[PDB]
Amino acid sequence: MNIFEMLRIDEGLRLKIYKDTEGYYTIGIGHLLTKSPSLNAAKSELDKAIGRNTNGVITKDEAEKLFNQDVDAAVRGILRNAKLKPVYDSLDAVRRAALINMVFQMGETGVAGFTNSLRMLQQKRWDEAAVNLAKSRWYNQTPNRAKRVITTFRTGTWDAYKNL
Ligand SMILES: [Cl-]
Structure with missing residues (x-):
């Protein structure tokens, strides 16, 4: 067991935009997109994060890429x-x-x-x-x-x- 498996258990994996426990637009392995209530705002953030016109769906490889970046950023955030x-x-x-x-x-x-x-x-x-x-x-x-x-x-x- 490691931090990636741990967070994968806690966050799940979804390949379409969904709302998290607080009602915020999210995708992948708990990757928050926006706190805005606009699905269009969320789709624009998603496309910017992935670098293509996604229409609210990503691949498993794309989700795992965002997950690697997010775990890296959490660690660097702690150390700073x-x-x-x-x-x-x-x-x-x-x-x-x-x-x-x-x-x-x-x-x-x-x-x-x-x-x-x-x-x-x-x-x-x-x-x-x-x-x-x-x-x-x-x-x-x-x-x-x-x-x-x-x-x-x-x-x-x-x-x-x-x-x-
Ligand atoms: Cl819970």
Whole structure:
């Protein structure tokens, strides 16, 4: 198990424009297109991202290309952010993937707002971090995904993603 397989479990794969859990236009493996309510705006973003006239459908290879770019960007976002980088550097490899998962879902700014949870992670108070992370809109809106990520921070294993 690695970060690509993990996010593929959490995000799924769809080759046509769809709305995500928040109602936003999305394609591929959780690639957000736009927060605008206009499908035309979303189709224009898609064509710009892919570089051809797609008419709202992409291939699996195109979806995997956007996915590689998005994972790369999440990592680079962590390492550039002064609040996230010291956390990431303090973590083992499994828990690093859990942090990347959160940044992929909610962005660098969103995760950098979990101030108290990040401090607990850095101190390696895993049970206390797990409790604090669950006191969040994130946990209440997407509880099955949040549980899996939180379990990964608590245990430092992939057990939440096996049998899936
Ligand atoms: Cl969920």
